[PDB]
Amino acid sequence: SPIRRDAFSIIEAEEYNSTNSSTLQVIGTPNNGRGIGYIENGNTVTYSNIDFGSGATGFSATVATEVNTSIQIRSDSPTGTLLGTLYVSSTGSWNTYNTVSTNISKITGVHDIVLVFSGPVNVDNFIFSRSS
Ligand SMILES: O[C@@H]1[C@@H](O)[C@H](O[C@@H]2CO[C@@H](O[C@@H]3CO[C@@H](O[C@@H]4CO[C@@H](O)[C@H](O)[C@H]4O)[C@H](O)[C@H]3O)[C@H](O)[C@H]2O)OC[C@H]1O
Ligand SMILES: [Ca+2]
Ligand code: NA
């Protein structure tokens, strides 16, 4: 998976750098994309060296799930700064994807990003939004 990435271009969830998960799989999506799934509560997924430049204050992800779930966005490590939490309610099926966004605290410079999952969700991709 790439050693570094730009916060303001699509990041593919399946191109993660490390995970604690023993269940996570790379899955297909309806339009022959890929994502991650078979995620459980407590699972973390790390993406290395994301460059936020002069700042990001939002997070958007394209996700599918049948259960209300939440995803913490942390900087640097699983115990690093909580940037925000994305609350995801059911999208209607494991294959019905929805872009869902949340606010985060302004982050600048280069940081690993850790997604922390409270339960099952399929994730295709994500991207950050620049501060104003
Ligand atoms: O070609 C594409 C197929 O690859 C794709 O397959 C889908 C792959 O993802 C699957 O999503 C799974 C569904 O099960 C979830 O686990 C459930 C979580 O809740 C629990 O209560 C329950 O016991 C578990 O079974 C898992 O988290 C999730 O990733 C999806 O079902 C497949 O259809 O489909 C699109 C094709 O074009
Ligand atoms: Ca993807
Ligand atoms: Na394992």
Is 34 annotated to bind ligand? yes
Is the shortest distance between the CB of 18 and ligand 1 below 6 Å? no
Would you list the DSSP string of the chain?
Answer: --S-EETTS-EETTS-SEE--SS-EEEE-TTS-EEEES--TT-EEEEEEEE-TT-EEEEEEEEE-SS-EEEEEEESSTTS-EEEEEEE---SSTT--EEEEEEEEEE-SEEEEEEEESS--EEEEEEEEE--
CB-neighbour burial class of residue 17 (10 A; exposed 0-12, middle 13-18, buried 19+) = middle
Is 94 close to ligand 1, i.e. is its CB under 6 Å away? yes
Please name the residues in contact with 71: beta carbons below 8 A apart, sequence gap of 6 or more. 61, 63, 85, 86, 88, 115, 116, 117, 118, 121, 123
User: What CATH number should be reported for the domain whose range is 1-132?
Assistant: 2.60.120.260
**Dist CA 61 CA 59 (whole Å):** 7
Ligand nearest to the CA of 24: 1
Task: Report the half-sphere exposure of 11 (CA within 13 A, side-chain side).
Answer: 30
Nearest ligand, measured from the Cα of 93: 1
Q: How was it solved?
A: X-ray
Residue entry with tokens 């997604």: 115
Is 15 marked as a binding-site residue?
no
- Measure the CA–CA gap between 100 and 121, rounded to whole angstroms: 12
- Residue ranges per structural domain of the chain: 1-132
Of 114, 40, 119, which Cα lies nearest the Cα of 78?
114
122 pocket-lining for ligand 1 (C-beta < 6 Å): yes
Q: Is 114 exposed, middle or buried (0-12, 13-18, 19+ CB in 10 A)?
A: buried
